[PDB]
Design a protein around this nucleic acid. Structure first.
Ligand SMILES: [Zn+2]
Lengths: 52, 200, 121, 82, 50, 104, 118
RNA sequence: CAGAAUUCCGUGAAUCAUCGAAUCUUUGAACGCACAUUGCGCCUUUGGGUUCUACCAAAGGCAUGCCUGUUUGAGUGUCAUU
RNA sequence: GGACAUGGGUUAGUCGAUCCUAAGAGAUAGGGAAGCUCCGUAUGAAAGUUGCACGAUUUUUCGUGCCUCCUAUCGAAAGGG
RNA sequence: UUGACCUCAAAUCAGGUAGGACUACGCGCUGAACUUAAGCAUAUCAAUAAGCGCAGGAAAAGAAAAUAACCAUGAUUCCCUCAGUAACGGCGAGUGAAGCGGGAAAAGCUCAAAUUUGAAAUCUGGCAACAUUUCUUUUGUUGUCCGAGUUGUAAUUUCAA
């Protein structure tokens, strides 16, 4: 279908072409262990729910 | 906030980041339909300053419009008149492509009221616009005093009557000597009506 | 001629049987008109038609009253039971929606309302 | 040949009764009424012909519902029992 | 042509009914000028045009 | 409503005096009237106009002072005269502002 | 997710039925054309008399929208006679005429006498 | 013209006036598909004739575009525990 | 008298229409056109009606699953039937 | 495997909305020619007739990116005047406004751009209850739940500040 083709050829297009550095900087991401540690810290500080 | 950063960054349309984003988004829009619903605005700061709010009842539609002038729709260039009216190829539509985009989106969503629109992208063949529309039948709109005016029947198809921002720009509505023509028909009637007073 | 103040008193099923009896009486009157009519029965044909109309009106009024009672205190009501003003009036803003104001507006009218004043020469 | 004898072969209808306006102006082959424009979702009208607009318009028929609205407006579209 | 649609036959029935004499008691009404009219249609003089 | 006295522009009409749209913010401040209360008591406010001359400023504040002196303000709460209101509203009647403050 | 066909087709959805929160019409209409609107009047012309006295058939003035089933049911419940065949005619005046043949165990003459046009 | 005299000290005549309740045939923006055809269909419920599936009848429904929300889904689009 | 007036008269499972398709017409997807509207008919569409016992007392059309080049209609009272 | 998010679908899903007609007046698009110039092409007729789209009881415009050059005025609209003037025009035929001044009526305002950040304080819908009615036909409130919304709903602010 068209939407499946669009969302697949989009990723193909980003793989092609020279991406400017201000956009390419988001392709670098924290590894698994640091992300796990970060989210463990986040889970101890969460906004109150409706009941709270 | 980040809206000021978005506004300042949107001016730098010749930058590498903007050029890359414009190219990839123009390709995506070309792949999509001529008129298609946009789940979220691609320029939130532009939508906000034009009146869009992130609440139920506000709709964003993206439409592409063909570029260029308006060729005279005559069969073979035959106008059957004086040579002054024989031009076929260098004529310009008096309404903007933004006006045409609002009119077509309004017809596509005849249950809604066209609030505003803004340019988002362009290429050689098409100009891309996002049109902000408001649902007059939604309770969130009918209970908001800041948008309650558009529910009144006097605002039906204001984009077709030229009551939008680009519509009034095309009509030449303004203050001063540069807009002496004013509303054209009203001014023409005022200047061409012969007032025959009762001399008694 | 049947009287509405007793037709309304009479029950729905009894009204249905009375309607059927009126219909067969009207059929008997009409075949009489075909195969030899008399002025009295021709005049009574109109009265029978009016009586049928009255019974149908009473039955319909009772049914609509029952529907209104069933749909009382409900958000959505049948369209025939809803408002019967103009289409523009139905689509117009309610007085509550028109009167809705912002907090800033409410404060402005609360603190600086129009005053009653007069001038002395 | 072009006259009297030619008129003797005219036995094939080109128009029939229109289902919207009732006139014998519904073109059979084009499936379009020359009077009202049926089945297009708009009544055929032109400003160069004002007598045709005079012939068919509001007030030339029954106005069954418009009379009721006019009567109801005088009392303000009130409901309930008297 | 003995091959007629329902709509055509109903129109023929309406036309035949309209082409009937007007009773005299109708013309006898006070202040009425309904005595005679040219709306009488004959099958050979004026055609129905479907 | 009470109107200020202004000088028409151009040399053809600068020798005359006519009625203006509304009193300026500086004139209201000099007369001790808030801009949010001037509209309530019927004093028009013109934010566009400015006082370039002391003569125009004093002329307009004099008009406001005369208007205030001759003004009777009904209390919002009946029988409870608040600050700036009046309790002699029995004899109040509709009078023309032109007679009180003609454009001279 | 093995696809053995080179085409994509829309999957199947639940397609829930309508459960309205209010009835669009408050009161259901009464049955139109029950018996009395179907049967208008009998016909007692010379040809109709011959049909009754010879072919054991009654002649009626049934409604334009009545068919040979509704006419048969209306005759059964109005005159307590079982038709065997029904012929339908549309007269040049625009009204429908019905020839209703009764069974051999019922005489159309007495039925017509009971109806009251003889 | 007659009839209406179950009437006229009475909820009662009248092509009376007014009007806040209803009825409102087939169509028509016309809306199941069509229509030079009163043509061809589908869904739910209730009844008839032996027909839990066929036939007949009645009642209620089935157009398109768009908005909000709901449900069921698709995606070698992005991810986590398993 | 094919005129005028008053009445009467056309009865179908088997005759035609209705069904099918031809030349063609024409929605829908989509694309133009300021627009009235133009092109377009599996067309660049997630275009499903159909094939199969998995539950099922016990001798059966009711909810899944996996599925494969189907498809709007109108258009002949001399074509087919 | 499941779930979450994003995007895209389907349902005779729950509730709604649009079409059409009326066009005297109103807001736009498109758009002639007859005619005048004693011919005729620019011009004129005319930014008109015809065609198309869209409203209301009025519409539109409207609170200056406005005039002016003054001792300055001060939202919009309409009337008188400016004025057949400045100006435009094979400078031919013809066309042709605006500031000021007088009068009618006068009414001002709302958002985006700010960190509520010690608390999304915001809104729709379902359900239930309680009120209300031009009205058993209308219009709300409260409670709870689910959604919208942090890719921003609320509040003080809109430059006069
Ligand atoms: Zn027609």
């Amino acid at each position: 279908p068209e939407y499946i083709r669009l969302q697949r050829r989009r990723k193909i297009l980003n793989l092609r072409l020279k991406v400017p550095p201000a956009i390419a900087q988001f392709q670098k991401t924290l590894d698994k262990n640091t992300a796990t540690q970060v989210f463990k810290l986040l889970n101890k500080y969460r906004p109150e729910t409706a009941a709270e | 906030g980040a809206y000021k950063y978005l506004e300042e960054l949107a001016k730098k349309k010749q930058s590498d980041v903007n050029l890359f984003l414009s190219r990839v988004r123009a390709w995506e829009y070309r792949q999509m339909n001529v008129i298609h619903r946009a789940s979220r605005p691609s320029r939130p700061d532009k939508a906000r300053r034009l009146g869009y709010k992130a609440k139920q009842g506000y709709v964003i539609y993206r439409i592409r419009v063909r570029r260029g002038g308006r060729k005279r729709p005559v069969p073979k260039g035959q106008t059957y008149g004086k040579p002054v009216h024989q031009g076929v190829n260098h004529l310009k539509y008096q309404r903007s492509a933004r006006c045409t985009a609002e009119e077509r989106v309004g017809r596509y969503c005849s249950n809604l009221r066209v609030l505003n629109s803004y340019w988002v992208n362009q290429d050689a063949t098409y100009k891309f616009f996002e049109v902000i529309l408001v649902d007059p039948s939604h309770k969130a709109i009918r209970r908001d005093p800041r948008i309650n005016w558009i529910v009144n029947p006097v605002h039906k198809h204001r984009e077709s009557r030229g009551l939008t921002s680009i519509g009034k720009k095309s009509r030449g509505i303004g203050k001063g000597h540069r807009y002496n023509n004013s509303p054209q028909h009203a001014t023409w009637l005022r200047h061409n009506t012969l007032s025959l007073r009762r001399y008694r | 001629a049947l009287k509405t103040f007793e037709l309304r008193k009479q029950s729905q099923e009894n009204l249905a049987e009375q309607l059927q009896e009126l219909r067969q009486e009207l059929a008997s009157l009409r075949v009489q008109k075909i195969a030899g009519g008399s002025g009295s029965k021709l005049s009574k044909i109109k009265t029978t038609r009016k009586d049928i109309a009255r019974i149908l009106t009473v039955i319909n009024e009772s049914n609509r009253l029952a529907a209104r009672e069933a749909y009382k205190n409900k958000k959505y009501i049948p369209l025939d039971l809803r408002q019967k003003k103009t289409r523009a009036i139905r689509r117009a803003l309610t007085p509550y929606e028109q009167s809705r104001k912002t907090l800033k507006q409410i404060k402005k009218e609360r603190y600086f309302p129009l005053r009653k004043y007069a001038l002395k020469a | 040949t072009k006259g009297t004898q030619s008129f003797g072969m005219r036995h094939n209808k080109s128009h029939t009764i229109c289902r919207r306006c009732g006139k014998r102006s519904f073109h059979i082959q084009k499936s379009t009424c020359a009077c009202c424009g049926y089945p297009a979702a708009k009544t055929r009208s032109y400003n160069w012909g004002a007598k045709a607009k005079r012939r068919r318009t509001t007030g030339t028929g029954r106005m069954s519902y418009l009379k009721k609205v006019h009567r109801s407006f005088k009392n303000g579209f009130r409901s309930g029992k008297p | 042509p003995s091959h007629k649609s329902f709509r055509t036959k109903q129109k023929l029935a309406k036309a035949a009914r309209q082409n009937r004499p007007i009773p005299q008691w109708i013309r006898l009404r006070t202040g009425n000028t309904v005595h005679y009219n040219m709306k009488r249609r004959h099958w050979r003089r004026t055609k129905l045009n479907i | 409503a009470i109107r200020p006295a202004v000088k028409p522009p151009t040399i053809r009409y600068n020798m005359k005096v006519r009625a203006g749209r509304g009193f300026t913010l500086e004139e209201l401040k000099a007369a001790g009237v808030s801009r949010r209360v001037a509209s309530t008591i019927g004093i028009p406010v013109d934010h566009r106009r400015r006082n370039r001359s002391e003569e125009s400023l004093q002329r307009n504040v004099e008009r406001i002072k005369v208007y205030l002196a001759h003004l009777i303000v009904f209390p919002r709460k009946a029988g409870q005269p608040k600050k700036g209101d009046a309790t002699d509203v029995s004899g109040a009647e509709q009078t023309d502002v032109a007679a009180v403050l003609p454009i001279t | 997710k093995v696809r053995t066909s080179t085409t994509f087709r829309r999957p199947k959805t639940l397609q829930l039925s309508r459960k309205p929160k209010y009835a669009r019409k408050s009161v259901a209409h009464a049955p139109r054309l029950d018996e009395y609107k179907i049967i208008v009047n009998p016909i007692n012309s010379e040809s109709a008399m011959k049909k009754i006295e010879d072919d054991n058939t009654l002649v009626f003035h049934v409604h334009l929208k009545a068919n040979k089933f509704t006419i048969k049911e209306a005759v059964r419940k109005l005159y307590s006679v079982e038709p065997v065949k029904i012929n339908t005619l549309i007269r040049p005046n625009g009204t429908k005429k019905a020839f209703v043949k009764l069974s051999a165990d019922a005489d159309a003459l007495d039925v017509a006498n009971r109806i009251g046009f003889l």
